[model samples]
Target: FTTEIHPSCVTRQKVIGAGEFGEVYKGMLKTKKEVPVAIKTLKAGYTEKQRVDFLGEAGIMGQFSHHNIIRLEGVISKYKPMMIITEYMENGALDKFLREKDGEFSVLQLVGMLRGIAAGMKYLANMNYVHRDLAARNILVNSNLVCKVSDFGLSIPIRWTAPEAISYRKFTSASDVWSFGIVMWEVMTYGERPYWELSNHEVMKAINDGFRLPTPMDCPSAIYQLMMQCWQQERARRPKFADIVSILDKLIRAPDSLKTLADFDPRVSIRLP
Candidate 1:
């Protein structure tokens, strides 16, 4: 049910970002009238496999219908430099937006953002689609402060990826939940770097040794517990996205539920033997 715009109808503007898929530019679509769009294009002379991979995310987006999920505008499949057009978000990536507005939002505001993401994941779960990459970086914030999940059909950074997925490369809705917790951490910490200075090898070792991410400083205990729940070693034991959606709904209604939570106490958490 998606439209296909001609290559000439799209004016690929300046580079806004880059990723595993290649350069993503802020495009202006001249279809009927002027429209702002994010154009993701594969490099020239791409393989048949690459073309399929590039459109794979579009294939997914075509079926998605949610306010918190990015909308695919159109595709340029039969062109030299193939393009996937999507709704533009002025605020760009959620991680970067939060960092820029650091310490400006209240706990309730942050929780609201989390709820939107959780709702999107719940929708994907119902569709039997695994995000495989769920992070603040993959979320886009509009000028209205609404966050939309974006970027799919590509690899994720080793840090945001789940422990099980890292080792065996097995992806499930549960693994996406693990990454969602990391996204929660990113939002609360306003983009604090994951694993600090640890390398991928170190990260793998630490998780294997039963080390999960410590609670973010000043993070409410309830939310921290939720995040930890998602990181359960047994993938199947992790809370479902539907469960998370329900929990976030509770947190929003009774923001006071957060009062029972305490700040992270690094002294007690960190042990030296």
Candidate 2:
């Protein structure tokens, strides 16, 4: 459960952007000292169900405590407009952050980012909290480039979802592993859209037909191998989040191990499995 904060504690500033619930603001949370926070406001004219659904993320985030997991500051619910407060990430979403700094980071840095994400996933998996939606867009990057998992209780992201999750509505740590593979692809490609131009329907068909995302240009051989392992046709064949972290940790420590690149033909849109 999340802490109930008084409305006076939140000082809403400029409107940074809008989310599925309402306008998100760059705000300050009054604690011991003024702390910068991202305030997600639930707009008016919403139903009772909408309010509960909007606060669902805070409820989930409240139980988490990991360096790579987004921190839930608290929430203001006993007021007109409900608000969820989270620690502000200077670089914002990982997807856009990667795009902006494309070609700027070293291979080791990229592996480090993936390791952080895997570490977060490992924590969630250890807690038996299956993240149905895991993507670069759902993750945040701070000023120091530390990636943290966020945006829980989110979308049915067709492209980022596992085949079994789409077909059987089955979600497990394995399904989350599948999504993390796509996130790895996103990081390697500097935020290229998953499935490229394929429609949702087409992506489902392509995946079922044994197609996987092609390796990004210059993606490290070891990283690509790990990605493919996560995309295994049988869910049971995928590596656990903990295993992924170990693999990434090895790659990060031995830079020479990542010197080789995955066999990639940038011209091809997808790889036939």
Best by TM-score: 2
Q: On residues 1-273, what C-alpha lDDT tens digit does candidate 2 reach at each position?
A: 578888898998988776666888888889879999999989888887887678888888998999999999999888968899999998888999999998999889998999999999999999998889899988999989999998786437899999889988999999999999999999999999998899999999888888889889989999999999999989999999999999999888888999999888856476688
Tens digits of lDDT, candidate 1, 1-273:
558889888988879986565789997988667899999888787777888778887988999989999999999877767789998999999988988998998888888899999999889878888888788988999888888888777534788888789878888888999999899889888888888899988988888899988878767788999998988889889999989999999988988887665566565565689
Model 1 ranges off by over 4 Å: 19-22, 31-33, 154-156, 266-273
RMSD of each: 3.7, 4.0
Report RMSD for candidate 2: 4.0
Question: Which portions of model 2 show Cα errors greater than 4 Å?
Answer: 266-273
Specify the highest-lDDT model's number.
2
For each candidate, the alpha-carbon lDDT, in order, equals 0.86, 0.90
Count backbone overlaps in model 2.
0
